[PDB]
Amino acid sequence: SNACTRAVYLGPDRMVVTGRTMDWKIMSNIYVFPRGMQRAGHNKEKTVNWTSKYGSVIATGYDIGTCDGMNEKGLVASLLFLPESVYSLPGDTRPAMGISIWTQYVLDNFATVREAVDEMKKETFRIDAPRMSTLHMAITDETGNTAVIEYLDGKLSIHEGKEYQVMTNSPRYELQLAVNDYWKEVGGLQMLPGTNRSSDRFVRASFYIHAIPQTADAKIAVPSVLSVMRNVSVPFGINTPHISSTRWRSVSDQKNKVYYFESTLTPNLFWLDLKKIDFSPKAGVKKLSLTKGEIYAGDAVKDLKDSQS
Amino acid sequence: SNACTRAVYLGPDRMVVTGRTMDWKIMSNIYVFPRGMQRAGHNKEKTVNWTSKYGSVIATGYDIGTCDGMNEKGLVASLLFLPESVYSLPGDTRPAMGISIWTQYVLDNFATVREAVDEMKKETFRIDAPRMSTLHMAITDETGNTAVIEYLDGKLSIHEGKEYQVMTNSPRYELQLAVNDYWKEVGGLQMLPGTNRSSDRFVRASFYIHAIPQTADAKIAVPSVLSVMRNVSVPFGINTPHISSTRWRSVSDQKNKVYYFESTLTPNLFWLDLKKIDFSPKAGVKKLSLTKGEIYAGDAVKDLKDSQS
Amino acid sequence: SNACTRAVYLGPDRMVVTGRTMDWKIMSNIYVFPRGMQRAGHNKEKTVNWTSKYGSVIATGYDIGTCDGMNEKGLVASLLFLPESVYSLPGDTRPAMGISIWTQYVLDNFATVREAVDEMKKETFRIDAPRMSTLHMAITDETGNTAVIEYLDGKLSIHEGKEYQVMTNSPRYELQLAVNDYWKEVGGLQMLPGTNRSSDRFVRASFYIHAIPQTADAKIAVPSVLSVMRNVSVPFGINTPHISSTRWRSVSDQKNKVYYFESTLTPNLFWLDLKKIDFSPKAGVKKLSLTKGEIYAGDAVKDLKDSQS
Amino acid sequence: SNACTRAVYLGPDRMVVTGRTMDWKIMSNIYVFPRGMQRAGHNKEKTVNWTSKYGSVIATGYDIGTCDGMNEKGLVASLLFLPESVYSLPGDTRPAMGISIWTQYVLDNFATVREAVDEMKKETFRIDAPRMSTLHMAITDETGNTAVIEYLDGKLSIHEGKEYQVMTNSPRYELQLAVNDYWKEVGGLQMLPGTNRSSDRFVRASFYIHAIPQTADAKIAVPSVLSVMRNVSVPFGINTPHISSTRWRSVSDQKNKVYYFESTLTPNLFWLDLKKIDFSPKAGVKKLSLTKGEIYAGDAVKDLKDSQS
């Protein structure tokens, strides 16, 4: 089973920091995409087209596409597993948006959760995912507003609000919140469920993200959000058969538009300060290779390589 | 309250790796001590003297002294809090060994848990700790044997064996094991206690340390043991008043005599390969300063500074 | 806070047995109502009227009215607390059905959950509850079908099916099921939540009701269902301030139309075999007084007193 | 596995009430033994002999002997399973006391826990239990003092004190207390372990026995202690293969020397008021048969039958 946790820290003075874990089995690489880029939602099906208003830094698995990123307006979008997802009922003839590019679409076109949601609520397109793939999304902007987007029984389901700070895997959000409610009756200092189960991670992330210091000093908030992410990670290679362990973590400082990243296998936290990056149309695509064991450190803009994408 | 966790990974082909967390409130610095060094157990009381047979790499708090280290025979000694500790009854007239130097004594004089224990069982000296300080020790050698040493009601208490892989804070070891036994009846895949409580950390460390992959590849075992340590860390600045959060982690590869170290505040894992270090009598004391926010990376022998100690 | 648990045992060969606890602070008495009785839903408001098709045995609190009973078709209806209940929005002009008589209405007019539900789905009337009162209902017939009826934000909410065997207090049913789902992932033999909390009782009742022997021998099923009810009772006078402890239990054998009853304060289980009771229109109302400490035993039809109601 | 729970309620004004559950698979019957009776500890081995100073009411299984009772000084003795029990090492040549009569010996000869313990501390005899049987005992007198007696690795182990109010099955008492300590850190209103496991029952009994009302009114204390016993009972026929479910409960009012008893299979609580019983030497042995499904109620002295024992 897969395991991913996402948690938004809401601090003082617009300090908004989003942490995310990726647990699989992932072949992740990082890409910088200048704005004004030209994209289509599908390669076979009838789609929708767009040219990207905002540049973005994103992470992508080989077979998953864009699954995490921040755009230059500091909007963060994250695609996490939700096995019961059902994107449409049989006979859906809308334009198709590939599950692998859905995240990019969001990061390319929206600066605000409010606009992301207003657009998605039109239901212009449907999400298309190949059979032999089931994911929900969480989006948060720099005001700290968040939307959780799920497809259940072919129907669109959205929760929007600052209070929706955590997301994990199953069950569907409405139910996940009830499980969290139950555990809050118990009290996080008395007992927390300590397992790698989707709902246990939700409860711990939700408890700790609200317990870390209310600070606006990124030197504190970032490593704090990171220690929460570490608490809800799945210890490495955990088999006890094929349990999904944490491979990487990311933390997006959405105030200062900085994107931190660490690998469970590689020693250090590195990052990409988006304020030091050229997102102008002609700047050209760049890439941080991670699949070759590369070991980055500190600011990694320097280590960006050019890519013909 | 304080919080520290320690866990020994026992792998194939003598792969022995010891992880340790330090949670406080710590002013830790790291020191390399050449062998043949000359030391006394106390500065006021009648003591015992020794000259160190083995060199060692150790970590020390300002007001605590040596609280963690590995010697060149790959023996690891760790001093963790145990609030109910009582070192002697009133009227104890033995030579006094300072609590702040007890760990060093062990690392200086022993290559094997077997010899450490045989010596301590003589009860030649008593442990002396100032009033306004309560600690137990765990020792493990490169054969993966471990001893847990506690003082309860002024009496020496030792558990020796490979199976004693985990240690935390209260209660006393015999009782800690019973709590762990209870939680194993429940099953770590079904439920784990997920709190920062001393016994919860014990149960999770004990479960995960046995669940990570049985490998002899340090490139795997080390980061694995580290992810266990991260699971039992206390998220940063956790207040919910004055709860003790993880400040640093250490991991001792006792097969390859390498000593890894990370700070919850500083980005990266660094280390000191003891095979690249001169422990010969005249080599002179060296130090890694950590109290000034220093940010180390990879091998940090290069960054060692000379120290007049 | 109040606490009530209800659980339906589904056995072989139409063995259907419903257990129910009543925890309060209750002044309960038991009444036998011949059929063809004439009733109105309210004493002040515009209501609906009916004459009862089926006789029934019911329990009633002084200030609550009919809160539990079985009718001669073996249909069982139970009113349990649900604090978030909201029966209508402001400006509701429908005929009003008193919360105190809602249960009786159900028992008087329906032999089958299917018909109860079909009628309620018309939403002809609204439920009226005085301010300074919040309850949901569960109904099950002799085929073992069950409906759970709740009013949330003034809207009617129903779950119908044999699988809906348990009901407790908050949260709303959809969410209660999610909490139960979570605890089933954990496994009832590994861990059960053991508290008097509404959701803990749900989880234990749900686990045990499915674990007791599949038998059609009432000599076994009844005492079994009773031992489940005893497991989810709240120990007496539990204060640790004003916690609601179990005062009585009831168990309805819906196959043999027998109604068992015990008081936490009084030694024995007694019952009323509905097959030995005259429900014909002229038979007249009868009553088992419980508020005077009466101690009944075995068959208590003999102890029935006449009542001018 | 077997399951038994025992819990002592300590109330105001010498109100001392001991509850006990019996879970097996039991063929229990109840016996009244006049004092001045003549008994030997074994039928084959070299034993010890005595003539009973106090009369007693006791319960006995077919193949277990005396496993629960109260004597006329209101002293209560209970034999519960402890699988790790080891009564002696090989080569023990002391007089042998049959495990089946050990309890009777205690009830026959002691009025006070203080004297029971002082005698047992001599270790005059050893406990003898046939191979193809492992039990610990708890004793409490009318001052509310209690002793827990266990044999571990052939050694006698005793805990004596008013605070030792609860006993269950494994692990050994010292360890059982640690598990209970852990769960008290968590808090019984926040979470209780709700399983039929030996330690879960200990924790719930220990929590609730201290939470029920502090009263000296037996009309309250007795049914209260009973509701605690019901909470830690094992629901009937629980299989989910061969799990041991509660068959009977007993409650000993040690202030008023009354002995209450109920069967999970039989409707009512009955009792034997020892103040209405003739324990004088010539009175003759009497018996309450329970193995034939007998259904008793209220005072059952009347139902006592004579027995040639």
Short mmCIF file of N, CA and C in Angstrom, two decimals, chain D residues 88-214:
data_model
loop_
_atom_site.label_atom_id
_atom_site.label_comp_id
_atom_site.label_asym_id
_atom_site.label_seq_id
_atom_site.Cartn_x
_atom_site.Cartn_y
_atom_site.Cartn_z
N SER D 88 7.77 -25.29 42.49
CA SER D 88 9.02 -25.70 43.10
C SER D 88 10.02 -26.13 42.05
N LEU D 89 11.29 -26.12 42.43
CA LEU D 89 12.32 -26.65 41.57
C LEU D 89 12.39 -28.16 41.77
N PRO D 90 13.01 -28.88 40.83
CA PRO D 90 13.17 -30.33 40.97
C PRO D 90 13.88 -30.68 42.28
N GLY D 91 13.45 -31.77 42.92
CA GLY D 91 14.07 -32.21 44.16
C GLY D 91 13.55 -31.55 45.42
N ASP D 92 12.28 -31.14 45.42
CA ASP D 92 11.69 -30.48 46.59
C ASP D 92 11.02 -31.52 47.48
N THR D 93 11.46 -31.60 48.73
CA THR D 93 11.05 -32.71 49.59
C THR D 93 10.15 -32.29 50.73
N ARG D 94 9.68 -31.05 50.68
CA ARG D 94 8.78 -30.56 51.71
C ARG D 94 7.45 -31.28 51.66
N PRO D 95 6.68 -31.19 52.75
CA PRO D 95 5.28 -31.62 52.71
C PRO D 95 4.56 -30.92 51.54
N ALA D 96 3.64 -31.64 50.91
CA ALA D 96 3.00 -31.16 49.70
C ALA D 96 1.59 -30.69 50.01
N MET D 97 1.25 -29.49 49.57
CA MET D 97 -0.13 -29.00 49.70
C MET D 97 -0.77 -29.00 48.33
N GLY D 98 -1.82 -29.80 48.16
CA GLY D 98 -2.52 -29.89 46.89
C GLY D 98 -3.06 -28.54 46.44
N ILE D 99 -2.85 -28.23 45.16
CA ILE D 99 -3.30 -26.97 44.58
C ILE D 99 -4.82 -26.88 44.73
N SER D 100 -5.48 -28.04 44.71
CA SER D 100 -6.92 -28.10 44.80
C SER D 100 -7.48 -27.79 46.19
N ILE D 101 -6.62 -27.73 47.20
CA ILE D 101 -7.10 -27.57 48.57
C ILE D 101 -6.38 -26.41 49.26
N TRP D 102 -5.36 -25.89 48.59
CA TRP D 102 -4.64 -24.72 49.08
C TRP D 102 -5.58 -23.58 49.52
N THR D 103 -6.61 -23.32 48.73
CA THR D 103 -7.50 -22.21 49.02
C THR D 103 -8.25 -22.50 50.32
N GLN D 104 -8.79 -23.71 50.43
CA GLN D 104 -9.50 -24.14 51.64
C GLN D 104 -8.61 -24.01 52.88
N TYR D 105 -7.37 -24.48 52.76
CA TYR D 105 -6.44 -24.34 53.86
C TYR D 105 -6.42 -22.89 54.35
N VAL D 106 -6.34 -21.95 53.42
CA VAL D 106 -6.27 -20.54 53.78
C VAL D 106 -7.54 -20.07 54.50
N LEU D 107 -8.69 -20.40 53.92
CA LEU D 107 -9.97 -20.01 54.47
C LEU D 107 -10.27 -20.70 55.81
N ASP D 108 -9.70 -21.88 56.01
CA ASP D 108 -9.97 -22.65 57.22
C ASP D 108 -9.22 -22.09 58.41
N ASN D 109 -8.05 -21.51 58.15
CA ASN D 109 -7.09 -21.26 59.22
C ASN D 109 -6.77 -19.81 59.53
N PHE D 110 -7.34 -18.89 58.76
CA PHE D 110 -6.92 -17.49 58.90
C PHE D 110 -8.07 -16.49 58.88
N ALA D 111 -7.94 -15.47 59.71
CA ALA D 111 -8.99 -14.48 59.85
C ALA D 111 -8.44 -13.18 59.31
N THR D 112 -7.13 -13.15 59.15
CA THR D 112 -6.45 -11.92 58.84
C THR D 112 -5.37 -12.16 57.77
N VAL D 113 -5.21 -11.22 56.85
CA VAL D 113 -4.19 -11.37 55.83
C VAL D 113 -2.84 -11.46 56.50
N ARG D 114 -2.69 -10.68 57.56
CA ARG D 114 -1.44 -10.62 58.34
C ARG D 114 -1.00 -12.00 58.83
N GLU D 115 -1.95 -12.78 59.33
CA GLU D 115 -1.61 -14.11 59.79
C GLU D 115 -1.43 -15.08 58.63
N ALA D 116 -2.28 -14.98 57.61
CA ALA D 116 -2.10 -15.81 56.41
C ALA D 116 -0.68 -15.66 55.88
N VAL D 117 -0.25 -14.42 55.71
CA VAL D 117 1.06 -14.14 55.15
C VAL D 117 2.19 -14.65 56.06
N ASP D 118 2.11 -14.32 57.34
CA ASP D 118 3.13 -14.74 58.30
C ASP D 118 3.32 -16.26 58.25
N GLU D 119 2.23 -17.00 58.21
CA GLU D 119 2.32 -18.44 58.05
C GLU D 119 2.95 -18.85 56.71
N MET D 120 2.49 -18.29 55.60
CA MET D 120 3.00 -18.72 54.30
C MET D 120 4.47 -18.41 54.16
N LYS D 121 4.91 -17.35 54.83
CA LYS D 121 6.31 -16.93 54.75
C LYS D 121 7.26 -17.94 55.36
N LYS D 122 6.74 -18.87 56.16
CA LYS D 122 7.57 -19.95 56.69
C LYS D 122 7.97 -20.95 55.60
N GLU D 123 7.10 -21.13 54.61
CA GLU D 123 7.42 -21.98 53.46
C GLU D 123 7.61 -23.44 53.87
N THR D 124 6.91 -23.79 54.95
CA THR D 124 6.80 -25.14 55.48
C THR D 124 6.48 -26.17 54.41
N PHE D 125 5.48 -25.89 53.59
CA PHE D 125 5.09 -26.81 52.54
C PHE D 125 5.31 -26.22 51.16
N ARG D 126 5.10 -27.05 50.15
CA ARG D 126 5.22 -26.63 48.78
C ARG D 126 3.87 -26.91 48.14
N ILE D 127 3.59 -26.26 47.02
CA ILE D 127 2.31 -26.48 46.37
C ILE D 127 2.50 -27.56 45.32
N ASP D 128 1.62 -28.54 45.32
CA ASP D 128 1.73 -29.65 44.39
C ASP D 128 0.62 -29.65 43.36
N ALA D 129 0.99 -29.59 42.08
CA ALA D 129 0.01 -29.62 41.01
C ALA D 129 0.37 -30.66 39.96
N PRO D 130 -0.55 -31.61 39.73
CA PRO D 130 -0.40 -32.68 38.74
C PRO D 130 -0.04 -32.14 37.35
N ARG D 131 0.69 -32.94 36.58
CA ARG D 131 1.06 -32.60 35.20
C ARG D 131 0.08 -33.24 34.24
N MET D 132 -0.51 -32.43 33.35
CA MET D 132 -1.61 -32.88 32.48
C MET D 132 -2.58 -33.80 33.21
N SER D 133 -4.02 -25.90 36.51
CA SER D 133 -2.91 -26.39 37.33
C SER D 133 -1.92 -25.28 37.72
N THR D 134 -1.91 -24.18 36.98
CA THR D 134 -0.98 -23.07 37.27
C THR D 134 -1.74 -21.83 37.77
N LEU D 135 -1.64 -21.54 39.06
CA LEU D 135 -2.51 -20.53 39.66
C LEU D 135 -1.82 -19.64 40.68
N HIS D 136 -2.29 -18.39 40.78
CA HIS D 136 -1.88 -17.52 41.89
C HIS D 136 -3.10 -17.20 42.75
N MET D 137 -2.85 -16.70 43.95
CA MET D 137 -3.93 -16.46 44.88
C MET D 137 -3.95 -15.02 45.32
N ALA D 138 -5.14 -14.50 45.57
CA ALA D 138 -5.23 -13.21 46.23
C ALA D 138 -6.10 -13.36 47.47
N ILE D 139 -5.65 -12.78 48.58
CA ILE D 139 -6.39 -12.86 49.84
C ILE D 139 -6.67 -11.48 50.37
N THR D 140 -7.89 -11.24 50.79
CA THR D 140 -8.16 -9.97 51.48
C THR D 140 -9.08 -10.13 52.70
N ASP D 141 -8.71 -9.46 53.79
CA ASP D 141 -9.49 -9.56 55.02
C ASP D 141 -10.45 -8.37 55.13
N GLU D 142 -11.18 -8.30 56.24
CA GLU D 142 -12.22 -7.28 56.41
C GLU D 142 -11.69 -5.89 56.73
N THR D 143 -10.39 -5.77 56.98
CA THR D 143 -9.77 -4.47 57.12
C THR D 143 -9.38 -3.95 55.74
N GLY D 144 -9.61 -4.77 54.72
CA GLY D 144 -9.29 -4.38 53.36
C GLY D 144 -7.83 -4.58 52.95
N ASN D 145 -7.03 -5.15 53.84
CA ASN D 145 -5.68 -5.55 53.48
C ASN D 145 -5.71 -6.73 52.51
N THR D 146 -4.75 -6.77 51.59
CA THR D 146 -4.72 -7.81 50.56
C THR D 146 -3.32 -8.35 50.39
N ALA D 147 -3.21 -9.64 50.12
CA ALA D 147 -1.95 -10.21 49.67
C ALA D 147 -2.13 -10.95 48.36
N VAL D 148 -1.15 -10.79 47.49
CA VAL D 148 -1.10 -11.50 46.23
C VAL D 148 0.04 -12.50 46.32
N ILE D 149 -0.28 -13.77 46.11
CA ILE D 149 0.73 -14.80 46.30
C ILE D 149 1.02 -15.53 45.01
N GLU D 150 2.28 -15.51 44.59
CA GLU D 150 2.65 -16.17 43.34
C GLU D 150 3.89 -17.03 43.53
N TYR D 151 4.00 -18.08 42.72
CA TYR D 151 5.20 -18.90 42.67
C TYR D 151 5.88 -18.79 41.32
N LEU D 152 7.05 -18.17 41.32
CA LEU D 152 7.78 -17.93 40.09
C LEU D 152 9.13 -18.61 40.15
N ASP D 153 9.38 -19.51 39.21
CA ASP D 153 10.64 -20.24 39.18
C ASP D 153 10.87 -20.91 40.52
N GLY D 154 9.82 -21.53 41.04
CA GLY D 154 9.90 -22.25 42.29
C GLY D 154 10.05 -21.38 43.52
N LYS D 155 10.04 -20.06 43.37
CA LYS D 155 10.14 -19.17 44.53
C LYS D 155 8.83 -18.46 44.89
N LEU D 156 8.60 -18.32 46.19
CA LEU D 156 7.41 -17.68 46.74
C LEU D 156 7.50 -16.17 46.51
N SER D 157 6.44 -15.56 46.01
CA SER D 157 6.46 -14.12 45.83
C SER D 157 5.17 -13.50 46.34
N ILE D 158 5.29 -12.54 47.25
CA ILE D 158 4.12 -11.95 47.88
C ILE D 158 4.12 -10.43 47.80
N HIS D 159 2.97 -9.87 47.45
CA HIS D 159 2.76 -8.43 47.61
C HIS D 159 1.68 -8.27 48.66
N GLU D 160 1.96 -7.49 49.70
CA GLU D 160 0.98 -7.27 50.73
C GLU D 160 0.69 -5.79 50.89
N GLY D 161 -0.59 -5.43 50.93
CA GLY D 161 -0.99 -4.05 51.14
C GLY D 161 -2.41 -3.78 50.71
N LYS D 162 -3.03 -2.75 51.28
CA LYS D 162 -4.38 -2.34 50.88
C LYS D 162 -4.44 -1.89 49.41
N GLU D 163 -3.34 -1.35 48.91
CA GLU D 163 -3.30 -0.81 47.56
C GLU D 163 -3.36 -1.88 46.48
N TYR D 164 -3.08 -3.14 46.84
CA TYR D 164 -3.09 -4.19 45.84
C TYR D 164 -4.48 -4.77 45.62
N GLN D 165 -5.35 -3.96 45.01
CA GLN D 165 -6.78 -4.26 44.97
C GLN D 165 -7.22 -5.12 43.81
N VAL D 166 -6.35 -5.26 42.81
CA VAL D 166 -6.76 -5.95 41.59
C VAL D 166 -5.83 -7.11 41.24
N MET D 167 -6.39 -8.17 40.69
CA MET D 167 -5.54 -9.23 40.19
C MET D 167 -6.23 -9.88 39.02
N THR D 168 -5.43 -10.36 38.10
CA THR D 168 -5.95 -10.86 36.86
C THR D 168 -5.13 -12.15 36.52
N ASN D 169 -4.61 -12.30 35.31
CA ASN D 169 -3.80 -13.47 34.99
C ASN D 169 -2.37 -13.02 34.75
N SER D 170 -1.72 -13.43 33.66
CA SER D 170 -0.32 -12.97 33.46
C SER D 170 -0.26 -11.52 33.03
N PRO D 171 0.91 -10.88 33.17
CA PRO D 171 2.18 -11.41 33.69
C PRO D 171 2.26 -11.38 35.21
N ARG D 172 3.42 -11.76 35.75
CA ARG D 172 3.66 -11.75 37.19
C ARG D 172 3.40 -10.37 37.76
N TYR D 173 2.90 -10.35 39.00
CA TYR D 173 2.35 -9.14 39.58
C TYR D 173 3.14 -7.84 39.42
N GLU D 174 4.45 -7.92 39.66
CA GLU D 174 5.37 -6.78 39.58
C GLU D 174 5.26 -6.14 38.20
N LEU D 175 5.19 -6.99 37.19
CA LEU D 175 5.11 -6.56 35.81
C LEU D 175 3.68 -6.07 35.47
N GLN D 176 2.68 -6.80 35.95
CA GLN D 176 1.30 -6.37 35.77
C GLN D 176 1.12 -4.93 36.26
N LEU D 177 1.65 -4.62 37.44
CA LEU D 177 1.57 -3.27 37.96
C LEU D 177 2.22 -2.23 37.00
N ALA D 178 3.30 -2.61 36.33
CA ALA D 178 3.97 -1.66 35.44
C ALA D 178 3.05 -1.38 34.25
N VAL D 179 2.42 -2.42 33.72
CA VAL D 179 1.50 -2.22 32.62
C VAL D 179 0.37 -1.30 33.07
N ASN D 180 -0.13 -1.51 34.29
CA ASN D 180 -1.19 -0.65 34.81
C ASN D 180 -0.71 0.79 34.98
N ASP D 181 0.51 0.94 35.46
CA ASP D 181 1.12 2.26 35.57
C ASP D 181 1.14 2.96 34.22
N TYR D 182 1.59 2.25 33.19
CA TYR D 182 1.61 2.84 31.85
C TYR D 182 0.20 3.38 31.49
N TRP D 183 -0.81 2.54 31.65
CA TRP D 183 -2.15 2.96 31.27
C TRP D 183 -2.74 4.10 32.11
N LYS D 184 -2.28 4.24 33.35
CA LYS D 184 -2.67 5.38 34.17
C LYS D 184 -2.03 6.69 33.69
N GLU D 185 -0.79 6.64 33.19
CA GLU D 185 -0.20 7.80 32.51
C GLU D 185 -1.16 8.27 31.41
N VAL D 186 -1.80 7.32 30.72
CA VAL D 186 -2.67 7.68 29.60
C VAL D 186 -3.97 8.29 30.09
N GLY D 187 -4.49 7.75 31.19
CA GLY D 187 -5.73 8.23 31.78
C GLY D 187 -6.97 7.48 31.35
N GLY D 188 -7.66 6.89 32.33
CA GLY D 188 -8.82 6.06 32.06
C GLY D 188 -10.02 6.72 31.42
N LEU D 189 -10.10 8.04 31.51
CA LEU D 189 -11.19 8.73 30.81
C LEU D 189 -10.84 9.01 29.36
N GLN D 190 -9.54 9.05 29.08
CA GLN D 190 -9.09 9.30 27.72
C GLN D 190 -9.09 8.00 26.92
N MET D 191 -8.35 7.01 27.42
CA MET D 191 -8.34 5.69 26.80
C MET D 191 -8.16 4.56 27.82
N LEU D 192 -8.89 3.47 27.60
CA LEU D 192 -8.73 2.24 28.34
C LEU D 192 -8.57 1.17 27.29
N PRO D 193 -7.72 0.17 27.56
CA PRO D 193 -7.65 -0.98 26.66
C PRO D 193 -8.90 -1.83 26.87
N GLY D 194 -9.63 -2.14 25.80
CA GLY D 194 -10.97 -2.70 25.94
C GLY D 194 -11.12 -4.17 25.59
N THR D 195 -10.00 -4.87 25.56
CA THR D 195 -9.95 -6.26 25.12
C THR D 195 -10.20 -7.23 26.31
N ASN D 196 -10.31 -8.53 26.02
CA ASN D 196 -10.40 -9.56 27.06
C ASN D 196 -9.02 -10.04 27.57
N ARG D 197 -7.95 -9.42 27.08
CA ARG D 197 -6.58 -9.76 27.49
C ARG D 197 -6.44 -9.55 28.98
N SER D 198 -5.64 -10.40 29.61
CA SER D 198 -5.39 -10.33 31.04
C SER D 198 -5.03 -8.94 31.52
N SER D 199 -4.08 -8.27 30.85
CA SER D 199 -3.69 -6.92 31.28
C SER D 199 -4.75 -5.84 31.02
N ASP D 200 -5.54 -5.99 29.95
CA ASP D 200 -6.62 -5.02 29.68
C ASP D 200 -7.66 -5.08 30.82
N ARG D 201 -8.03 -6.30 31.22
CA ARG D 201 -9.00 -6.46 32.30
C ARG D 201 -8.44 -5.85 33.59
N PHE D 202 -7.15 -6.06 33.85
CA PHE D 202 -6.53 -5.49 35.03
C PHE D 202 -6.71 -3.97 35.02
N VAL D 203 -6.47 -3.35 33.87
CA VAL D 203 -6.41 -1.89 33.81
C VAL D 203 -7.81 -1.32 33.99
N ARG D 204 -8.79 -1.92 33.33
CA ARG D 204 -10.17 -1.45 33.48
C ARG D 204 -10.73 -1.68 34.90
N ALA D 205 -10.49 -2.86 35.47
CA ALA D 205 -10.93 -3.15 36.82
C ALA D 205 -10.28 -2.18 37.78
N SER D 206 -8.99 -1.97 37.60
CA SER D 206 -8.27 -1.06 38.48
C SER D 206 -8.82 0.37 38.34
N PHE D 207 -9.14 0.79 37.12
CA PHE D 207 -9.65 2.14 36.94
C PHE D 207 -11.07 2.29 37.53
N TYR D 208 -11.97 1.40 37.16
CA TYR D 208 -13.35 1.51 37.61
C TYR D 208 -13.55 1.25 39.10
N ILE D 209 -12.81 0.30 39.67
CA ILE D 209 -13.00 0.03 41.09
C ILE D 209 -12.70 1.29 41.93
N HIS D 210 -11.86 2.17 41.41
CA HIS D 210 -11.53 3.40 42.12
C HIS D 210 -12.48 4.53 41.73
N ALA D 211 -13.31 4.30 40.72
CA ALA D 211 -14.17 5.35 40.20
C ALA D 211 -15.61 5.24 40.70
N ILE D 212 -16.03 4.04 41.07
CA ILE D 212 -17.36 3.88 41.62
C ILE D 212 -17.49 4.65 42.93
N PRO D 213 -18.73 5.00 43.28
CA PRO D 213 -19.03 5.87 44.42
C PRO D 213 -18.45 5.33 45.71
N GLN D 214 -17.86 6.21 46.51
CA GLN D 214 -17.46 5.89 47.87
C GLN D 214 -18.67 5.88 48.81
#
